C-alpha cells in the first residue's frame, strides 16, 4: 500500500485529474438559502482553463 501511495507523483496526479476532472460533467446537490449559488453552466465552464 505504501509503495502504491508513494508511486504517485505530480505527473501521475495531473494525468489522473485530466482523466477525471478536465471538462467532465458535475452533479450538484444543494439545499438551503442557495439563491446565490451559481447555476450548472457556471460549474461546467469552471471545469477547464482557457489560459493554458
Amino acid at each position: 500500500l505504501f509503495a502504491r501511495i508513494d508511486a504517485v507523483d505530480a505527473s501521475t496526479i495531473k494525468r489522473v485529474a485530466n482523466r477525471f476532472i478536465y471538462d467532465k460533467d458535475v452533479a450538484i446537490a444543494a439545499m438551503g438559502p442557495i439563491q446565490r449559488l451559481p447555476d450548472y453552466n457556471w460549474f461546467r465552464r469552471r471545469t477547464y482553463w482557457n489560459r493554458y
Binding site: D25, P33, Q35, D39, Y40, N41, R44
Partner: protein
C-alpha cells in the same frame, strides 16, 4: 432590487445529455395551429386597414383617370 425566494425544488439536466435542435421542428403542425389561431385577430387588424386603403386609393385613382382622360 432584491430577490424573492420561493421555496421550490428544481431538477436540471446537463446540456450535453439532451438533444438540442430537434425541438424546433418537433410538433410543428400544432405550433402552426397555435400561431394562426391565437393571432388571426391581430393580423386582421394590422393588414385590413392597409389593404382596404390601398384598394380605395387604386379605385379612386382609376376612376379619376377615366373621368379626366377625355
Amino acid at each position: 432590487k432584491q430577490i424573492v425566494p420561493v421555496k421550490s425544488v428544481i431538477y436540471a439536466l446537463s446540456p450535453f445529455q439532451q438533444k438540442v435542435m430537434t425541438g424546433l421542428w418537433k410538433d410543428l403542425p400544432t405550433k402552426i395551429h397555435h400561431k394562426v389561431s391565437e393571432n388571426w385577430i391581430s393580423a386582421t387588424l394590422l393588414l385590413g386597414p392597409l389593404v382596404g386603403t390601398y384598394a380605395y386609393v387604386q379605385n379612386y385613382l382609376e376612376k379619376e383617370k377615366l373621368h379626366h382622360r377625355y
